[model samples]
Target: EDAMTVLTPLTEKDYEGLKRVLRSLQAHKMAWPFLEPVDPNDAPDYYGVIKEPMDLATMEERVQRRYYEKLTEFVADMTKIFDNCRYYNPSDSPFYQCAEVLESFFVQKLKGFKASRSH
Candidate 1:
């Protein structure tokens, strides 16, 4: 995929605490332009997006925040895309086979991310 994002990576020592945001995005169900609240799951997104790393803690926070941001955006946009199918064309009509299409596309750009750019 030619997928690209303006997002930056986390500053954690390793994938230590990086899985949290991922945990957040996982199993996100669609509900209109926004996803309905989950079971108050583990994904808290305490950190904001980190474009520049000030330290280890700072970078991790940014990474998680940015990830969640993209996560939500992708979900919402995918929902919109699915809705537009009825108005525009049929090619995108099958977009929502299970409401998880958002993450499928989201993961494409996210796949194979190892260390942070600063790492």
Candidate 2:
């Protein structure tokens, strides 16, 4: 039963709720740096270090394509963007700070979303 629950696709309400979640994330001021794919030409070492780069635009496209089924899958991808940003930039840099703030914001929103699922 537990395994099946993990395998279950998001219901319509869940899918719509996830879209709203992404919209709010993108609306954040700290989200600018993560809105699109990083240009390798601009930062030659970025791809070399962050093997699994993720971005809001990419996530949006995935949602449109139904690339995600479980909530955990979507959550992991969202977190990957923050993790990659933190790994690439020094803590003292503004970029790293943005990741830290945005990650916290996402976690809080996720908590609310999970709670909504029960009601």
Candidate 3:
């Protein structure tokens, strides 16, 4: 027996449109790696030490720290995206419109999850 994965069929135009949107989003995300504020002087040494053998508690703490760092990076990137649409491309109304809708949706969903967690 052989295992295979089924793929959804998309028209060429749809595929190309999806590709363009994905590329734009990826480029936007990639632009901010250096924008994250890790102290440049300490990062190399910090990373080197963290790479060495560590116990479960140390590993868990590192993972938690990384999660916070990633969340901060994401918030910064989203702020830039919102600002770009608002100020630089005021004529491009769709960008800001979509961002507003999506941001609202995310907030609502996240709030629901938090409410559930508190119960």
Candidate 4:
């Protein structure tokens, strides 16, 4: 049998995206890190939030890992979004791209949260 649970978001609304569990692929990605901590000795140093693997050895652990997995992808996707804008021409002044990225992240998370709520 399988179990499904609700997820809590960092700044989620009274909507659905707040309770979204990490998907299968996100879990797959997390499994690697959760199973094995990066050996700074084995490879270069990492500079990210999730630096160590988690022990999702039980059902509760797995559920907790789901939120972690979701955040992992969230950070990754955020970087992918902002990094692409680096190549664009200057945004008429400093911090223009900064605000642009902030708004972009807002629309994606906040607006999507509202949109997904109705679906």
TM-score of each: 0.23, 0.91, 0.33, 0.25
At residue 58, give the lDDT of candidate 3: 32
lDDT of 2: 0.88
Best candidate per lDDT, number? 2
Ranking by lDDT: 2, 4, 1, 3
Question: Which 10-residue span in candidate 2 carries the lowest summed lDDT?
Answer: 1-10
Model 1 gets an lDDT of 0.37
Name the runs in model 3 displaced over 4 angstroms: 1-66, 69-81
Candidate 3 similarity to native, TM-score: 0.33
**Stretches of model 2 off by over 4 angstroms after superposition:** 1-8
Cα lDDT computed for each candidate against the true fold? 0.37, 0.88, 0.37, 0.38
Model 2 pairs whose backbones collide: none
The candidate with the higher TM-score, 1 or 3, is 3
Q: At residue 19, what lDDT does model 1 achieve? A: 55
Clashing pairs in model 3?
Answer: none
Across residues 1-119, which tens digit of lDDT does each residue of candidate 3 receive?
01111122333443333334323433443333222332438445533433222222332343334432322332343444444434423445664565565445434543443344224
If both were scored by TM-score, which would come out higher, candidate 2 or candidate 3?
2
Q: After superposition, how far is residue 81 of candidate 4 from its true place, in Å?
A: 1.2
- Pick out the ten consecutive residues of candidate 1 with the lowest summed lDDT: 46-55
Q: Taking the tens digit of each residue's C-alpha lDDT, what string does model 2 give over 1-119?
A: 24533676788888888998999999999999999999988899998888898999999999988888898899889989989988888989999999999999998898878778766
Q: On a 0 to 100 scale, what is the lDDT of residue 113 in model 3?
A: 32
